[PDB]
């Protein structure tokens, strides 16, 4: 293994003490911990093993006729898998809680030792030493293992959810989304970590309630049945809350899915969202979903407030109810009965009225999360391949449907075959079926009739270029061996030579997710170069050529496809008729039908804070929650609860110390004796209980309310800042690193931190309370105790110096999981094309293992601290207790009267306070990561103090003066010394090779990065205007069409600013109307995520429909019809000329026949502008680059273009 792990060879004593972990603190005390410091995950805990285990049981649950008479149960598979490993921890839970019940009895026997006798109480002390050793050192290794039972289940679920995700059919990727799958891997599987802690207390709680009522019936007698009567009410009631926690979690997760789904589309769409200035729309949509989500989080947190309010006060109710129903029958005695009742209920309070109510909420949150995962694991999957002989593709009578019903077939009658040495060109209108035909050969679209046979390994060049976070080399190697001569051949043939020469830092350039840091036709050639490097047998080329320049397109077709691939099997989706002459067969599709098939001759980064969670971060978490007056009120309410609680301890003592009195001069004489005012004593004692109950309930709701409200405002600010972040931020930070904050950390601020903060706070006040009376009682003990406080703060800081780093490593090392997930979810058809699924699983497991290394340290370091605390405290408290046997009554005789009592459970409460005090500061690491993206670098303001005139671009004049541009402050100049004037209403063509900076003119115009020189729009500097006044008033069609899941209305007109009649008008003028009319809901048809329901050419047509609606005077048309077929494009060009005749129009296109009817052509060559003249004034100069580029289009094409250039010039 890469790294050791001392747990594999730790001696058992070093294991129970976690003493083997001590060397980690030696470095964490001195350094920020590093991922290379974290110990390797143990071999049995590997993500590969855990997932392959539980998938075995889940396979045996769906299969083997375990479906014969039932639906599958993922819970039965989980139980069958883990029951033996978990029931063996139940036996320790039985011994543990037996020891808790034994402790007060035998210490009570020491209180009964009171009077000394030979060699007697040393038996009880020997039981107390054995008991406290269980409670204080063995408990922690037990607790570590019940936590690892949850980690193992969590990691097993994560593996098999991703194993499923790779297999999901396109029928199923409509029923699920990246938002759900990220939510499964982040919230729903996270429940499993906490569930297995409490799960044994579903039985150890109720069983221990029955044990104490039996023991008190042997002590108090029948009145102990009133204590049990409370539990016989309370525990069935809290069992019914499980039904509400299940319901409320299922509702919450449905809104968390929708939030993460929308957030994913914001983060991926952010550049186009910015250019449209739709940021206000997504701000409202996310804040609506967050309100709906946080409502059910708030309600379920209020039930959790009742549970924790029952923990505080129900024991005091029990000791009230069992005593009021006793003094109405008998007499309260100093120490004696009341000491035994208080200590028995005090020892058992935790399990019956904290861990049991917690267990039934935690498990009811599990079972819904299991149903969420089970309903994912039962989704549809892709069937395995439909030969050692002749390699071929063969398709026969094939018909298939993307949508199972209510539709015409996507493909019908397909009957083609293609052998090595042939290229099949598939051709036809937008949406005709060309990419669906590749999806048929690729097996992503299953046949409903006919058959497909594929004898060879495929390389798929998808129509949208998939590119993943890595180096440009890694994108081309795709895990294949590096081999210099093969690599140089493909980068030459794919024209990535020169591009890898023209700066980029060369090859090995780091590329952001989705290939965002590349031009559209450059990532398209990386996407082609990957396939050619794989040296496959069958090449499925989904039009790689429409993405690239005319010269580069000829270069690719000759030196790559014809040279390298023409000996392979090739199917080429294309629109470039100039290449169809070279295809061995051509196939034309209309509406999925094979129209004709034949021959052309016959057809015609270590972002982790260094140290403490500063006081400012706590202040921000609280001031995000409520105004300070509410926290002053909360402090008063918190102390009012605790004072009322501890006054019941004192009042029973005071009552007992006055019912024990000497004035019983004759007991049979009745009121001749000073019989106690039972109505007065029960009056005040009842009052103190209702104070304890009501202030306990009130503080629990108030803490949850303000901390849930804090999670609301910290989300809101973190989303606004990210939305207003510059595009550079999204190029730099992986999608999964951002979604980690919105999924996991916000999930922690919603559910887990508000609970653990209250749990700490109310434990702190109890410790503060009892210690204070433990300084009124045996006041000398403060002198022994003062060094204990010093040791605890020293041990806390020494621990926290390491624990905070471990928790930052833990939270950080999770973000690769979600960025790899989202990258591979986009890549699925390509991953499944190469059959790289086993490789992508191996990568994903490597991310789980790296996170498991940090979680293993998180669990273990917590237990190192908790052992060191509990050993020191047990030694302290047992010395105080054992001192009674060396007559510590000589230090204070009050030790005999006011029994040691609650100090026996101070050996627990003091520990849980200091232990959970550190847990809260570990949980506050998630607050820092949310605060971090609140405080990120802002983009320039959306509106300045200056604003334009209300009709500002009255003439669409644009002037660039000396301007140069770079995408990052140290980056290369992607544009250099631009100087051009665009006249009013001037239709300007922008042309030049892939990479030449022409789409960076848009980044300068929309100021997505600051240009380094002046740009004037109608005599206003774009640098002296707010970004929404700038961006709203220029229409854009971007190079890559992005669509949002939502209605067609929501995709055309997010603000409802236009009538649906105008939307039908826009759809008619892109001639997409006939398509939308065929869809069952028309305007109300739901887009699948990223628009996947539409063909890529139709995704472009909705982007024109958007720009037609905006009606601005300035339009910027970035390659908008690249994927549109020529016969549909020529009708769109006609409509662009007619619709936007008054506009200025920066038409950026490689299709020069769209450009040639233009007033001026900008030709830019390496970011430098070098030609700006009428098209014919360039073409008549045969030295011009525009002449060369038109010449590269071919002989008759250049003649036709030169002719129509003359026609537009002679006017
Ligand atoms: N993943 C999908 N799920 C459902 N329907 C789809 C999917 N991909 C395409 N379609 C539908 O199939 C029909 C289109 O097909 P295809 O996507 O096969 O066309 P194309 O040949 O790729 O066209 P273009 O390249 O011009 O976009 C379209 O009308 C589209 O609605
Ligand atoms: N977000 C970015 N961050 C850094 N560099 C970028 C970014 N987008 C593009 N580039 C770089 O800027 C230069 C590319 O430009 P642009 O993207 O302006 O070219 P294009 O003319 O639009 O190309 P194509 O015809 O391939 O679409 C390329 O060499 C690319 O590496
Ligand atoms: Mg571009
Ligand atoms: Mg297509």
UniProtKB/Swiss-Prot annotation:
Domain ABC transmembrane type-1 stretches: 86-364, 631-922
Post-translational modification: N-glycosylated; leading to substrate-selective effects on its transport activity.
Consequence of changing residue 291 to N: Transport properties comparable to wild-type
Subcellular location: Basolateral cell membrane; Apical cell membrane
Gene3D superfamilies in the record: ABC transporter type 1, transmembrane domain, P-loop containing nucleotide triphosphate hydrolases
Enzyme Commission numbers on file: 7.6.2.-, 7.6.2.2, 7.6.2.3
Pfam family, one: ABC_tran
Residue ranges crossing the lipid bilayer per the database entry: 87-107, 123-143, 194-214, 215-235, 315-335, 338-358, 423-443, 627-647, 688-708, 753-773, 775-795, 871-891, 894-914, 955-975
Cleaved signal peptide residues: none
Any one GO molecular function term: ATP binding
Topology with respect to the bilayer: Multi-pass membrane protein
Domain ABC transporter: 393-604, 958-1191
Residues that carry a glycan: 663, 671
Cofactor: Mg(2+)
Effect of residue 1059 to M: 10% reduced expression level compared to wild-type; transport properties comparable to wild-type
A GO CC term attached to the entry: membrane
Residues that coordinate or bind ATP 2: 992-999
Regulation: GSH stimulates the transport of MRP4. Urate inhibits methotrexate transport but stimulates cGMP transport. Nonsteroidal anti-inflammatory drugs (NSAIDs) strongly suppress the transport of MRP4 substrates.
Uppermost EC category: translocase
InterPro entries: AAA+_ATPase, ABC1_TM_dom, ABC1_TM_sf, ABC_transporter-like_ATP-bd, ABC_transporter-like_CS, ABC_transporter_C-like, ABCC4_TMD1, ABCC4_TMD2
GO BP, one annotated term: urate transport
Record keywords: ATP-binding, Cell membrane, Glycoprotein, Lipid transport, Membrane, Nucleotide-binding, Phosphoprotein, Repeat, Translocase, Transmembrane, Transmembrane helix, Transport
Tissue and organ expression note: Widely expressed, with particularly high levels in prostate, but is barely detectable in liver. sinusoidal membrane of hepatocytes.
Role noted for this protein: ATP-dependent transporter of the ATP-binding cassette (ABC) family that actively extrudes physiological compounds and xenobiotics from cells. Transports a range of endogenous molecules that have a key role in cellular communication and signaling, including cyclic nucleotides such as cyclic AMP (cAMP) and cyclic GMP (cGMP), bile acids, steroid conjugates, urate, and prostaglandins. Mediates the ATP-dependent efflux of glutathione conjugates such as leukotriene C4 (LTC4) and leukotriene B4 (LTB4) too.
Self-association state and partner proteins as the record states: Interacts (via PDZ-binding motif) with SNX27 (via PDZ domain); this interaction accelerates MRP4 internalization.
Protein known as: ATP-binding cassette sub-family C member 4
Species name: Homo sapiens (Human)
Phylogenetic lineage: Eukaryota, Metazoa, Chordata, Craniata, Vertebrata
